[PDB]
């Protein structure tokens, strides 16, 4: 089972530094050149750096040159990436990829990838979310919860302590111009049961130890 | 710097269809081209290397053709496991990728169910106000949501968010959030989102008067 | 000085002393 | 003068070991990677092993892997080849070749070869040859006669006629390896049939590896 | 493993002729191909490297073309020094060689002179018996020597040996040696070698009855 495992990602502020490590197993890591490839939230793929099989040659993308430094430890089967003077645009998931092996003069495609590691660069400090109810108004009615202003990602939302799943839509978060995240979670229910059944959403934001349960009832 | 351009950006198809994706390079790259497959949340997966060669372990229904500047990834018969996003990559002058083509599941047209939500009284006690308008279970994804505050078309204050295709009925759901200040929210009366979709005869408007 | 040259171990690489 | 000189080959039985040495001069042996290439009797060229200029990398052919070991001494300007657990198919002439110098990152052709060294692996023990006469009888004015040099090991033997006095019209055939593991050749000469009675003909077989010298009279 | 296949294996030519040798690869080797010249007893000489580059000191009559899988060594005008064996070699995936092309000197047809030799009385005392039949000074090499023991075509018990082309007249000489046991030799009466050659009108038979 040949695999690559990135690690070391997290939340950092602009100007700060972070170090990513990618641990190889199942193959001979000292015979392969490696790459770093990052993928910004909701965008395509971007190349970062390449290192030779013996670390004798290193090349960097113009968008990280001088700031990033690639390295490897062939005795522990580990690839590294030192990221200095981090910027907001550097926010992405970082993959390590393996160059397919050939005896030819030129390199080949990336035939093995890791699961990635998320690096988030934002000056915003940690903040818990506020939960506001989306009340239904006059055969099927809709209601939900607004999980506004939190940092960083992610949050988890459940309804009736996990009892309610059918018809639930938890939308992907969007990054507000303030640097804080905000998502919504909605669910369609029979309008006849609006009075009989009570509906409660369960927001959980582990990075700030914030747990909120908000009752969603029709306003008068 | 070589730039890769994929077409189309989105593609609807059913199981069993023959799917063709094209990838164009800003200059000749010989046959130094690769094709990758990526599903949401997972890692990319090598499919085709050196323009035409099939990566070991990849099903034979995946073929790659092309040389120079025009390339083609072809799935001879689409399978339920093949709905994902596909990237092409050149490795002739450094390494650049295309923006990707998403292969989506095709289904019959379904009109959205529209719901508008006034800002909560609790949020108004804080100083800000956000108005949410929901598009529930529709296809195709292409939809247009416009906010009208007192019949003044708003632009710049809204943010949309869309769900992935439903595992059960293969439909989409969208949420547009208009955010105002309490100052400007308390002074106006009528708030509406106008939804345009293929399944709707004429555009549908859901609205409310403030304080009703 | 080509970055797209083979980054892997290669039996058919230059076995000389080329600095 | 830039030259390569192989040495250390000989005749051995299967399972025995040999070490080949190839002495370089005229160039900087410490800067070139070297190869070993062997050529079986009457066959094409086969690659054996390669060593880097500093001995840091080695690759071998699958037919010698585990049994052969390549090495080099940059202070003695000498390439080596340790041949353990020898087999019959290892019988060949072994050349050392120099990788041509190029400014690119890829390897080149073998631009300089040595004269080779002969390695013979055979279970047959040393045996001297028997010499049988090929007598002429009764074709136009010139008749043919010769000597049969049957059953010897190893190669070679030398055959002359009338103690070197007779050379014109002599054909000494290349030896052939019989199914017994022993070699056998023939040496013939065309002579005027009128001198069949006047002149006496004697062939001179010499097998130095067994100290065998035979003079055989060929008469009707 | 990449395999190289040369064509042809043998080639007759005179001084001044244009000689073309082809070398084909089981898969693409780009331009990583070399050409060597080898004469009997001597070492190989590098002639061409990287498909087309001529090694310094090699006459310009040696040219090389090709890329991918099909290559060609061309001697624009043959010279007396160029009669040898030529090998092609790839150095793209490890190192393999072609089986070789032997360039032979052409001359006019010359029929062989056949001589048959019964086994010596001395050899029969040992237990074995060898019957030698000689072909002296002929061209081309292609000859068929068949043994018929009491008019029964023998196969498997004979071995041929051929000399290199004569330095003076460029002719060949062959020796076919039938090796039998004393028991098998004493049971049959008539022994003959039947020689088929281009220079012979009809096949030539030289024979003897055992005991003359």
Between CA E71 and CA E77, with CA E75 as vertex, the angle to 5 degrees is 155
User: β-strands B70-75, A18-25: how paired?
Assistant: unpaired
What is the rounded distance in angstroms from the CA atom of residue D124 to the CA atom of residue D121?
A: 9
Nearest to D159 by CA among D127, D220, D218, D207: D207
Resolution (A): 3.2
Pinpoint the alpha helices (H) of B67-152: 121-126
- B47-55 — which CB contacts under 8 Å span 24+ positions? B47/B73, B47/B86, B48/B73, B49/A100, B49/A108, B49/A109, B49/A111, B50/A108, B50/A109, B55/A111
Give, as one character, the DSSP assignment of residue B164: P
DSSP A166-202: TTEEEPPPEE-TTS-EEEEEEEEEEGGGGTTS-EEEE
CA distances from A16 to A10, A66, A90, A120, E117 (A): 12, 15, 12, 11, 98
Residue of D nearest to A31 (CA): D57
Angstroms from A207 CA to nearest CA on chain E: 53
Nearest to E115 by CA among D219, A171, D136: D136
Give, as one character, the DSSP assignment of residue A162: T
DSSP chain E: ---EEEE-SEEEE-TT--EEEEEEESS--TT-EEEEEE-TTS-EEEEEETTTEEPTTS-TTEEEEEETTEEEEEESS--GGG-SEEEEEE-SSS-EE---EEEEEP---BPPEEEEEPPPHHHHTTTEEEEEEEEEEEBSS-EEEEEEETS-B--SSEEEEEPPPPTTT--EEEEEEEEEEHHHHHH--EEEEEEEETT-SS-EEEEEES--
CA distances from D25 to B201, D30, D97 (A): 91, 11, 13
| Technique of determination | X-ray
Q: Which residues of C1-19 are buried (b: 16+ CB within 10 A; e: fewer)?
A: eebbbbbbbbebbbbbeee
Strand A210-216's sheet: what is its strand order? A156-159, A199-205, A210-216
* D167 close to D195: Cβ distance less than 8 angstroms: no
* A175 close to A154: Cβ distance less than 8 angstroms: no
Nearest CB to A109 within list B89, B94, B179: B89
Q: What is the SS3 string spanning chain D?
A: CCEEEEECCCEECCCCCEEEEEEEECCCHHHCCEEEEEECCCCCCEEEEEECCCCCCEEECCCCCCCEEEEEECCCCEEEEEECCCCHHHCEEEEEEEECCCCCCECCCEEEECCCEEEEECCCCCECCEEEEECCCCCCCEEEEEEEEEEEECCCCEEEECCCCECCCEEECCCEECCCCCEEEEEEEEEEHHHHCCCCCEEEEEEHHHCEEEEEECCC
| Interface D:B, ≥3 CB–CB pairs < 8 Å | no
Give kind and range of the element (H or E) at residue A50: strand A46-51
A9 Cβ partners below 8 Å, 6+ apart? A18, A20, A93, A94, A117, A118, A119, A120
Q: Is A207 helix (H, G, I), strand (E, B) or coil?
A: helix
Pinpoint the alpha helices (H) of chain B: 121-126, 182-187
Nearest to A49 by CA among A29, A66, A64: A64
Neighbours of chain A (3+ CB pairs under 8 A): B, C, D, E
- Put simply, the answer to whether E136 touches D171 (Cβ < 8 Å) is yes
Residue A105: CB atoms within 10 A of its CB come to 19
Neighbours of chain B (3+ CB pairs under 8 A): A, C
* A120 close to A153: Cβ distance less than 8 angstroms: yes
D102 Cβ partners below 8 Å, 6+ apart? C14, C16, C18, D108
User: β-strands B96-97, D142-152: how paired?
Assistant: unpaired
| Residue A124 burial (C-beta neighbours within 10 Å; 0-12, 13-18, 19+) | middle
What is the rounded distance in angstroms from the CA atom of residue B95 to the CA atom of residue A108?
A: 11
Backbone angles phi, psi at A174, to 5 degrees: -120, 145
What is the rounded distance in angstroms from the CA atom of residue D120 to the CA atom of residue A49?
A: 53
CA distances from E1 to B89, E27, E122 (A): 28, 9, 53
Beta bridge partners of E46: E36
What is the rounded distance in angstroms from the CA atom of residue E172 to the CA atom of residue E164?
A: 7
Residues of C in contact with A33 (CB under 8 A): 6-8
Breaks (C-N over 2.5 A) in chain E follow: none
Angstroms from A93 CA to nearest CA on chain C: 24
CA D8, distance to chain mean position in Å, is 13
What CATH number belongs to A125-220?
2.60.40.10
Backbone angles phi, psi at A118, to 5 degrees: -90, 125
C-alpha radius of gyration, chain E, whole number: 23
Angstroms from D54 CA to nearest CA on chain C: 8
Q: Is A92 helix (H, G, I), strand (E, B) or coil?
A: strand
Between CA B3 and CA B5, with CA B4 as vertex, the angle to 5 degrees is 120
Q: Is B100 helix (H, G, I), strand (E, B) or coil?
A: coil
E91 Cβ partners below 8 Å, 6+ apart? C12, D107, D108, D109, E32, E33, E34
* A149 close to A184: Cβ distance less than 8 angstroms: no
B99 Cβ partners below 8 Å, 6+ apart? A44, B4, B5, B6, B9
- Put simply, the answer to whether B92 touches C4 (Cβ < 8 Å) is yes
What is the rounded distance in angstroms from the CA atom of residue D41 to the CA atom of residue D48?
A: 16
DSSP B197-211: ETT-SS-EEEEEETT
Tokens of C9: 């171990």
Give kind and range of the element (H or E) at residue B159: strand B158-162
| Residue B92 burial (C-beta neighbours within 10 Å; 0-12, 13-18, 19+) | middle
CA distances from E43 to A125, D24, D26, D43, D83 (A): 76, 16, 18, 14, 21
Q: Which residues of A150-165 are buried (b: 16+ CB within 10 A; e: fewer)?
A: bbbbebebbbeeeebe
Angstroms from B18 CA to nearest CA on chain A: 25
B157 touches chain A (CB under 8 A): no
Pinpoint the alpha helices (H) of chain A: none
Backbone angles phi, psi at B65, to 5 degrees: -130, 170
The maximal CA–CA distance of chain A, rounded, in angstroms, is: 75
What is the rounded distance in angstroms from the CA atom of residue A142 to the CA atom of residue D144?
A: 116
- Put simply, the answer to whether D174 touches E94 (Cβ < 8 Å) is no
Nearest to A135 by CA among D64, E163, D161, B116: B116
- Put simply, the answer to whether D184 touches E99 (Cβ < 8 Å) is no
C5 touches chain A (CB under 8 A): yes
* E85 close to E102: Cβ distance less than 8 angstroms: yes
Q: Which residues of D156-178 are buried (b: 16+ CB within 10 A; e: fewer)?
A: ebebbbbeeebeeebbbbbbebb
D117 Cβ partners below 8 Å, 6+ apart? D6, D7, D8, D9, D20, D93, D94
What is the rounded distance in angstroms from the CA atom of residue E159 to the CA atom of residue E56?
A: 43
Tokens of A29: 């890591």
Q: Is C3 helix (H, G, I), strand (E, B) or coil?
A: coil
- Delineate the domains of chain E, giving CATH numbers in brackets: 1-107 (2.60.40.10), 109-210 (2.60.40.10)
Which segments of chain A belong to CATH 2.60.40.10?
A: 125-220
* E137 close to E173: Cβ distance less than 8 angstroms: yes
| Interface B:E, ≥3 CB–CB pairs < 8 Å | no
Breaks (C-N over 2.5 A) in chain D follow: 138
CA A107, distance to chain mean position in Å, is 30
Using the structure block, give the residue that is written with the tokens 């997972």: B42
Bond preceding residue D145 cis, omega within 30 of 0: no
């Amino acid at each position: 089972q040949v695999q690559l495992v990135e690690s070391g990602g997290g939340v950092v502020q602009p100007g700060r530094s972070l170090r990513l490590s990618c641990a190889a197993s199942g193959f001979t890591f000292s015979n392969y050149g490696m790459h770093w490839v990052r993928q910004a939230p909701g965008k395509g793929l971007e190349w970062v750096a390449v290192i030779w099989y013996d670390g004798s040659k290193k090349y960097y993308a113009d968008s990280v040159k001088g700031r990033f430094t690639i390295s490897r430890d062939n005795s522990k089967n580990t690839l590294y990436l030192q990221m200095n003077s981090l910027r907001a645009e550097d926010t992405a998931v970082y993959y390590c990829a393996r160059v397919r092996d050939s005896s030819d003069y030129y390199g080949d495609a990336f035939d093995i990838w890791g699961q990635g590691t998320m690096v988030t660069v934002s000056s915003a400090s940690t903040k818990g979310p506020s939960v506001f109810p989306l009340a239904p108004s006059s055969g099927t009615a809709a209601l939900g919860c607004l999980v506004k202003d939190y940092f960083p990602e992610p949050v988890t939302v459940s309804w009736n302590s996990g009892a309610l799943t059918s018809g639930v839509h938890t939308f992907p978060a969007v990054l507000q111009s303030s640097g804080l995240y905000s998502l919504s979670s909605v669910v369609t229910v029979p309008s006849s049961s609006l009075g009989t059944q009570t509906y409660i959403c369960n927001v959980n934001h582990k990075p700030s130890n914030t747990k909120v349960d908000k009752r969603v009832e029709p306003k008068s | 710097d070589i730039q890769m351009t994929q077409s189309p950006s989105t593609l609807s198809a059913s199981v069993g269809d023959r799917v063709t994706i094209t990838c164009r390079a800003s200059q000749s790259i010989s046959s130094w081209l690769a094709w990758y497959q990526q599903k949401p949340g997972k890692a990319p997966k090598l499919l085709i290397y050196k323009a035409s060669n099939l990566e070991s372990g990849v099903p034979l229904r995946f073929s790659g053709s092309g040389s120079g500047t025009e390339f083609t990834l072809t799935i001879s018969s689409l399978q339920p496991d093949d709905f994902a996003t596909y990237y092409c990559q050149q490795y002739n002058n450094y390494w650049t990728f295309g923006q990707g083509t998403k292969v989506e599941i095709k289904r019959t047209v379904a009109a959205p169910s529209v719901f508008i939500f006034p800002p909560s009284d609790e949020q108004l006690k804080s100083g800000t106000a956000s108005v949410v308008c929901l598009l529930n279970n529709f296809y195709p994804r292409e939809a247009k949501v416009q906010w009208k505050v007192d019949n003044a078309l708003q632009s710049g204050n809204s943010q949309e968010s869309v769900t992935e295709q439903d595992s059960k009925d293969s439909t989409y759901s969208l949420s547009s959030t208009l955010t105002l200040s309490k100052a400007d929210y308390e002074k106006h009366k009528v708030y509406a989102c106008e939804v345009t979709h293929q399944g709707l005869s004429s555009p549908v408007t859901k609205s409310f008067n403030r304080g009703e | 000085a080509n970055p797209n040259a083979n980054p892997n171990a290669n039996p058919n690489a230059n076995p000389n002393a080329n600095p």
